[PDB]
Amino acid sequence: GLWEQCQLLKSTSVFARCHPLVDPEPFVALCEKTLCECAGGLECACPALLEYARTCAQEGMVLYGWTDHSACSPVCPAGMEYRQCVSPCARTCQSL
Amino acid sequence: QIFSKIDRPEASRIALLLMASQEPQRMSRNFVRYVQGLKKKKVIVIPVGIGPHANLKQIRLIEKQAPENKAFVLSSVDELEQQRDEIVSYLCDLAPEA
């Protein structure tokens, strides 16, 4: 009942944008492997989706929807939120 | 309704079908009849499947009617701009000069 979560890489529009650049087949295979290995729920899929999205970003196509077209949210520090395409030279209270 | 009668016999006429979603089965049952009628009314139909949810079946059923109906299938709208030149050149190659 979790295998469909890996097929998001093939079925779901935000991931499907990147098929000309990154082949989903290895990442969905690895996803099915983590679904075999992992004892949790649907979150057991998420590392393969995250690494596919990061591979697409490295190939120059950011997957802005991926973390809400899916149940997968990466871990973040308290009061922060995960997002794609955070800028370098991040502004702070102390920085010119 | 569009080609209710041909008013330009000299021209080529083409339906560029930008399509991104599946029909439910109960609606699909006349699709082959309409596309073959469009061929009989000398209309070219060019299917452009966009994203995972375009039903490839109807793309290929359009292609099966004539080789002029050459399909496009795309991972997202973002590469439509990347298809633009081959699409518009193919459209013009499939049309006669004055």
Swiss-Prot record, chain A:
Q: Gene symbol?
A: VWF
- Judging by the UniProt lineage, the source's domain of life is Eukaryota
Q: What is the lineage of its organism?
A: Eukaryota, Metazoa, Chordata, Craniata, Vertebrata
Entry protein name: von Willebrand antigen 2
> Which species is listed as the source?
Homo sapiens (Human)
Swiss-Prot record, chain B:
Q: What is this protein called?
A: von Willebrand factor
- Interval of the full protein contained in this chain: 1367 to 1464 of 2813
